[PDB]
Paper text:
Although most chaperones are standalone proteins, isobutyryl-CoA mutase fused (IcmF) has a G-protein domain covalently attached to its target mutase. IcmF catalyzes the 1,2-rearrangement of isobutyryl-CoA to n-butyryl-CoA, as well as pivalyl-CoA and isovaleryl-CoA, using AdoCbl.
With 500 μM of the nonhydrolyzable GTP analog, GMPPCP, long chains of IcmF protomers are observed, with all visible IcmF protomers comprising these filamentous-like chains. To further investigate the structures of IcmF’s supramolecular complexes, we prepared cryogenic EM grids and collected datasets of C. metallidurans wt IcmF with GMPPCP and butyryl-CoA (wt IcmF + GMPPCP) and Q341A IcmF with GTP (Q341A IcmF + GTP). For the wt IcmF + GMPPCP dataset, the supramolecular complexes were first manually picked on the micrographs, extracted using helical parameters, and processed as a single particle dataset. Signal subtraction was utilized to remove the extra density that was due to the extraction of single particles from a continuous helical particle. Local B factor postprocessing was performed to yield a 6.7-Å resolution reconstruction. However, due to the lower resolution of the wt IcmF + GMPPCP reconstruction, there is no clear density for GMPPCP in the nucleotide-binding site. The G-protein domain interface adopts the same conformation as observed for MeaB in the GMPPCP-MeaB:MCMCbl complex structure. For both reconstructions, we observed an open conformation of the mutase active site. In terms of maturation, the formation of the supramolecular complexes made up of apo-IcmF molecules with GMPPCP (right) invokes an assembly line model in which a chain of open mutases can be filled in succession by an ATR that moves down the chain, delivering AdoCbl as it is synthesized.
Residue numbers in the entry:
A (entry chain B): 22 to 591, 593 to 904, 907 to 1010, 1019 to 1093
B (entry chain C): 299 to 378
C (entry chain A): 538 to 591, 593 to 616
The structure:
């Protein structure tokens, strides 16, 4: 029970994906009656400190679930003691990450308060909350400014103390009326923004602020005040509107979040005084967001100079406008979230209604200053049109403003252009599932017809063999012969030869002009001859054809037995290695790639690079520099990293793991590949290669461009929820660079990486993982199809990665996926078979893999590998902790297992370990049906776009985790070594000097490009404004810009993700 | 209405806001009507009358997301 | 009466033994003559039609004199 209004802040550290615990914590806090401004996850320390200082909050709540917090705590304490934040309480708690030794270190350091897991369990959360709240009983009235110097200068701390005085009424009322007089002499613009809270008005304000920043060159002093209703029961409120604001990145731009603090009134009673304070604070513009509005309230309109109303297409009947007197006084009206149906009709109706109200029959209703807009889509045309209309109104309102530097885009309606998804394309998933059903139906029908024909045939033969002359038999047989389908009859016709061709001990293939004859006989120690693939030996043809249609031989559509007709011959020991600087990594490569014919390198990076984070003098990342991955600053670092390794060699394979800035790294890789050849030719000639030599190098690189990239932006959004770029724009860039590749006929490189590894590690049931992956891949196909690209051109290069768990579902799941994939390619699009064949990678179980009794987990992994061997996996992966070092002991065990599979298993010499079992096919079909059902469920939910928009997969993983953990705790789930058979008896760091050297290299790169930095910025902005294929611009910018600069520019353009959910 | 020996009395409220719950003490039971479109789920913290509505109805079940709306609102009132 | 349905974590119904669903009867008879259900002649699929339900910890134990062996059994067969 605080005497005053207490303000608290909860937030998560940078690079944090898990915030549900802090979410429930903040729920309890606001339930207690605490006013909290939460900033979500991955928030800059400087940004959070600035926000807290400008908002003048009383307490700070911290949840540190990822470690490394100590730097942030120390820096924040130093800054608070530096900027008068010692009296502002700071509280933290992050579970068991803080070791009790670390707890003692923090306590002796001088931390305000750290909550131990033992303390959290014993004392309880409510008691701690009450203790803190009663502890925050501090008087801020002594902090109120006594003079007018701070107010005139614009000290927003002084203005916040003034707001507190207004709340307490302790301000000198004569001084307040004098402030009103000063505002009357000032008269700076005040914009009233009216509409429902959280509808997207924050995104609109963010985009408009960004537009004004770019047009007027960051020259606007913007003061923002938000008033929100107070929960009459609790008395507190969560000021969750500043959180969506991200374009406030300017010291002279200020924002304040406030409550109504009135039991009956929905607005603050001192709001005009706040307006006068902002006007006298020498702010070039004041923007106000209203609270939850009713029907006939129009109190804010006379208190502001311009009125802006926010509306949505959903408003009920058109007669609901007959009761909105607020709209009778709204100077500007905008229809928010134009993505829903009927929006254009409603716009026409409202325009007609306004025309009737104003009796302006001589004017055009569509020309009225009311626009329909969709806030979620970036670069919205209606947003630019409304900004232009606002500029025109300000000119009409007599606003001395700098001339517009932006092109004058015409119109009044956002057209939804650059919409990757075709609006109608959507329910494609149900279409595909129905196609699968129809394929099954047709297969059954054809099998039945062919069986009937065969039965009639043999019956006639026996009867004609019995001597009886019956002409009805041949007529009836012919009735089925024409009924028999042509393609099936062709497949029916092929049975005798292939049956005989594979009956022998050796298969011969005269390929092109040469011949490929390979023996088919395998011999055991007892001398028994083993055919590698043995076919069913049935007599009746109906079931034969049914099998063939449903299950062909390997290498035959739909490649159910695998894509490759015969097993690959052969040690693809993947060389995954990377840490520290270039020198250590190159030494390690020399260790691994010493005298190796085929270079198969796998490259990992630190999250700082994986997040595209520029190295910074802030210690927040300093402990993370060179940790768990190589931090790259410039192209030369990569070129040195690739010194002495002939990447143009066809046996040289490199697999790098990054998703977001991956095109930038690929551009750098192209630079390195070209530079190697150019420098070699220059040394070979003692002269610079000419433009003809440049074109020759270009064509040669296009010929020999080979590589693998582990990029998947989507999966970060599914499990980390840390994505920063709009996935729409990211996939647009993906399409642009893919278009470059097609235009450049890139044929040997691989950049797409679709996986379920984090999906599987999330605890996702395999069926859902499969279905979601299929949806994502086919939506990618549609997007590329929405790009007007031939399906067959890029499908062969499309890649997949899977993780294999324990359930009996995993037994055939890969085969089912292969079977459905081919028919999806064939029926819907009919791309060439080379596109229809699937390539994939398989990973063992990681979710069931645990340090708790890993010894038996190894034997479980044996079972895991069993199926993938029977499933004939083309690529098997065993997870590496690279956390503890992935020691060579595990690799020794895994390679031993692989060799045992390859040789020691005689059953492995067969190539059809699963064909025949009725259990197998029944499991297959039931799994098929279940996957279809899930597809229909997601298709019925508004497609992948809606499922991601609302968080469908979030609920999926939540339910799966809850059910699994309940089975685990109940003991119903039997677990070896945990729930059963209990035991009767029972870190790489880089020197800071290396980081400083790399930082010096990067700054020298900046110093090499500081004079030409303006040219690079202009080039970037030219790429930005036209919304073209940026990679063309990126091809040269990478040579003159660091990746951190690129990310900064991408965030500056407005591509930053706003936590608006 | 009560003294007129009327067996059941029905009242339709006028325009409402976020926190006003004035009619609830003036009535024996409380009923609210809502629609599937709700913007963010945080707006439930704005509806103080939701903490006191004896009954709630989600009109126009036709729009998408209404079922997940049921799930989330049911969880929210469960926590309430 | 013994249930034939088995349930997995995903709730999938599993029949412990599933016969072929062939259409022709000749190959059906061929199989039945060559392979019957468990508990049917010639019991290729095992004598017991249904799997034994159950802890076969065989106590292999003997060494030394009678007294030491009996103490060992006391340890094992307590």
């Amino acid at each position: 029970g605080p005497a005053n209004k207490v303000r608290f802040v909860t937030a998560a550290s940078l690079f944090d994906g898990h915030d549900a615990s802090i979410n429930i914590m903040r729920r309890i806090l606001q339930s207690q009656g605490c006013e909290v401004i939460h900033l979500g996850h991955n928030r800059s320390v400087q940004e959070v400190v600035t926000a807290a200082l400008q908002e003048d909050v009383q307490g700070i709540a911290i949840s540190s679930y990822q470690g490394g917090h100590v730097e942030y705590f120390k820096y924040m304490i130093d800054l608070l003691r530096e900027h008068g934040g010692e009296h502002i309480q700071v509280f933290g708690g992050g579970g068991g990450v803080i070791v009790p030794d670390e707890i003692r270190e923090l306590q002796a350091y001088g931390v305000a308060r750290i909550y131990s897991p033992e303390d959290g369990q014993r004392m309880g959360l409510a008691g701690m909350i009450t203790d803190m709240a009663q502890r925050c009983d501090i008087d801020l009235t002594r902090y109120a400014p006594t003079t007018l110097d701070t107010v005139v200068a614009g000290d927003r701390r002084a203005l916040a103390q003034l707001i507190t005085a207004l709340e307490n009424g302790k301000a000198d009322p004569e001084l307040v009326s004098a402030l009103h007089a000063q505002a009357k002499a000032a008269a700076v613009p005040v914009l009233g923004i009216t509409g429902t809270g959280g509808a997207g008005k924050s995104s609109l304000t963010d985009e408009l602020i960004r537009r004004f920043r770019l047009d007027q060159d960051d020259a606007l002093s913007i003061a923002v005040i938000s008033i929100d209703p107070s929960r009459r029961k609790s008395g507190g409120a969560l000021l969750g509107d500043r959180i969506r604001m991200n374009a406030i990145n300017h010291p002279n731009i200020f924002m304040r979040s406030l409550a109504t603090r009135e039991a009956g009134s929905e607005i603050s009673q001192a709001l005009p005084d706040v307006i006068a304070a902002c006007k006298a604070a020498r702010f070039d513009l004041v923007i106000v967001e209203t609270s939850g509005i009713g029907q006939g309230d129009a109190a804010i309109v006379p208190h502001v100079d311009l009125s802006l109303y926010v509306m949505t297409p959903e408003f009920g009947a058109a007669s609901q406008l007959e009761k909105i007197d607020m709209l009778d006084f709204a100077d500007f009206v905008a229809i928010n979230k134009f993505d829903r149906k009927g929006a254009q009709d409603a716009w026409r109706d409202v325009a007609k209604q306004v025309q009737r109200n104003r009796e302006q029959w001589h004017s055009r209703a569509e020309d009225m200053p009311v626009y329909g807009t969709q806030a979620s889509r970036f670069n919205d045309d209606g947003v630019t049109m409304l900004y232009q209309g606002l500029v025109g109104a300000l000119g009409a309102r007599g606003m001395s403003l700098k001339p517009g530097t932006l092109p004058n885009l015409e119109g009044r309606i956002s057209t939804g252009q650059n919409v990757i998804v075709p609006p109608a394309r959507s329910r494609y998933l149900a279409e595909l599932a129905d196609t699968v059903r129809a394929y099954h139906r047709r297969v059954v029908a054809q099998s039945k017809l062919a069986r009937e024909r065969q039965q009639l045939r043999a019956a006639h033969d026996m009867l004609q063999g019995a001597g009886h002359e019956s002409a009805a038999l041949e007529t009836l047989a012919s009735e089925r012969d024409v009924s028999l389908g042509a393609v099936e009859r062709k497949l029916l016709a092929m049975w005798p030869q292939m049956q005989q061709a594979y009956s022998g001990d050796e298969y011969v293939v005269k390929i092109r002009d040469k011949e490929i004859r390979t023996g088919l006989i395998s011999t055991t120690l007892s001398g028994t001859k083993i055919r590698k693939v043995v076919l069913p030996r049935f007599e009746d043809e109906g079931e034969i054809l049914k099998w063939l249609m449903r299950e062909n031989v390997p290498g035959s559509f739909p490649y159910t037995a695998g894509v490759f007709a015969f097993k690959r011959e052969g040690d693809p020991t993947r060389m995954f290695a990377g840490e520290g600087d270039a020198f250590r990594t190159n030494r390690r490569f020399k260790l691994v790639s010493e005298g190796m014919e085929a270079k198969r390198l796998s490259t990992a990076f630190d999250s700082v690079t994986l997040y595209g984070e520029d190295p910074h003098e802030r210690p927040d990342i300093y402990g993370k520099v060179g940790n768990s991955g190589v931090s790259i600053a410039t192209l030369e670092d990569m070129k040195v990293l690739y010194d002495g390794f002939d990447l143009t060699n066809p046996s040289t394979s490199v697999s790098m793991t990054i998703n977001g800035p991956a095109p930038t790294i690929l551009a750098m890789f192209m630079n390195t590949a070209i530079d190697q050849q150019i420098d070699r030719f220059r040394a070979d000639n003692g002269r610079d290669p000419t433009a003809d030599e440049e074109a020759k190098i270009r064509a040669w690189v296009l010929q020999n461009v080979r590589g693998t990239v582990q990029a998947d932006i989507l999966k970060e959004d599914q499990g980390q929820n840390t994505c920063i770029f709009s996935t729409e724009f990211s996939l647009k860039v993906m399409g642009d660079i893919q278009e470059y590749f097609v235009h450049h006929q890139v044929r040997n490189f691989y950049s797409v990486s679709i996986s379920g590894y984090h999906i599987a590690e999330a605890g996702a049931n395999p069926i859902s993982q499969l279905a979601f992956t299929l949806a994502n891949g086919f939506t990618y196909v549609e997007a590329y199809l929405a790009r007007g690209m031939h399906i067959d051109d890029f499908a062969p290069n499309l890649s997949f990665f899977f993780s294999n768990g324990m359930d009996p579902e995993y037994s055939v799941l890969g085969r089912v996926a292969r079977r459905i994939w081919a028919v999806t390619m064939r029926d819907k699009y009919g791309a060439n078979d080379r596109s229809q064949k699937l390539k994939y990678h398989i990973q063992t179980s990681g979710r069931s893999l645990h340090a708790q009794e890993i010894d038996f987990n190894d034997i479980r992994t044996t079972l895991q590998a069993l199926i993938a061997i029977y499933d004939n996996c083309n690529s098997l992966h065993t997870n590496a902790y690279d956390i503890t070092t992935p020691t060579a002991e595990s690799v020794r065990r895994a390679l031993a297992i692989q060799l045992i599979i390859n040789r020691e298993w005689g059953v492995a010499k067969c190539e059809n370990p699963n064909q025949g079992s009725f259990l197998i096919e029944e499991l297959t079909d039931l799994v098929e049906e279940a996957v279809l059902q899930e597809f229909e469920r997601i298709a019925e939910r508004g497609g992948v776009l809606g499922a991601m928009e609302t968080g469908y997969q979030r609920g999926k993983i939540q339910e799966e985790s809850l059910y699994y953990e309940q089975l685990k705790h109940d003991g119903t789930l039997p677990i070896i070594g945990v729930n059963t058979f209990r035991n009767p008896n029972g870190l790489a760091r880089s020197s800071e000097d290396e980081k400083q050297s790399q930082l010096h290299r990067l700054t020298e790169f900046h110093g090499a490009h500081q004079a030409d930095a303006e040219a690079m910025l202009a080039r970037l902005r030219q790429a930005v404004i036209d919304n073209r294929n940026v990679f063309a611009v990126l091809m040269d910018a990478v040579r003159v810009c660091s990746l951190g600069q690129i990310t900064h520019a991408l965030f500056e353009v407005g591509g930053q993700y706003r936590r608006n959910m």
